[PDB]
Amino acid sequence: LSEYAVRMSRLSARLFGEVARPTDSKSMKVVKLFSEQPLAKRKETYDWYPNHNTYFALMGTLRFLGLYRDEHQDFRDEQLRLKKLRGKGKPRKGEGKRA
């Protein structure tokens, strides 16, 4: 090692646009901190779930508008029909417990 080596390295450093003045290994993290995309910002993170409200509401609309057809919702519906026709329904809010 030499002073010629230190000055050569500083030359390369300030030239290439890398870290110029000697720093700790610890502080260097902050370098890498702005050198990247932060974790919570990445599209592979915040865009993880497709919007469920979108598909759900869209297809339900398209259904009542008579375009899409949901056999699951028809099963459900028909079964709550035969559940309430029996007399066991879903109580109007506030009524069930105390009465």
């Binding site: 646009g17 890398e18 870290v19 110029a20 003045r21 720093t23 502080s27 260097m28 902050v30 370098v31 890498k32 901190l33 702005f34 050198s35 990247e36 995309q37």
Partner: protein, 103 residues
């Protein structure tokens, strides 16, 4: 009405709906009109800051970081260094109390 499949493709492409060939992945993104020396050299916004202080150590690491970053445009980097000016000058009391006079 359509005369051919090629007419289909042609119209989709004029409309900008069909993709552009031979594909460059940068098609449709101009990056604000910027060039590298607006990205790489951040000296412009390091003008106002104490020069020999450790604040230049911290801000040179911040600078060298925002230089290496493809993920952000000019604007947001500048908002970073500006928020840093605003916050560093926000507390005048801390900097002076710490044992180094800082501008």
């Amino acid at each position: 009405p359509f005369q051919n499949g090629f007419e289909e493709m042609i119209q989709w492409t004029k409309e900008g709906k069909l993709w552009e060939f031979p594909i460059n992945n940068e098609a449709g993104f101009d990056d604000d009109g910027s060039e590298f020396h607006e990205h790489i050299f951040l000296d412009k916004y390091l003008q106002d800051f104490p020069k020999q202080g450790p604040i230049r150590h911290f801000m040179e690491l911040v600078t060298c970081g925002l230089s290496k970053n493809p993920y952000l445009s000019v604007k947001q980097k500048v908002e970073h260094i500006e928020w840093f000016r605003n916050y560093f000058n926000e507390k005048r009391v801390i900097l002076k109390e710490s044992g180094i006079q800082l501008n």
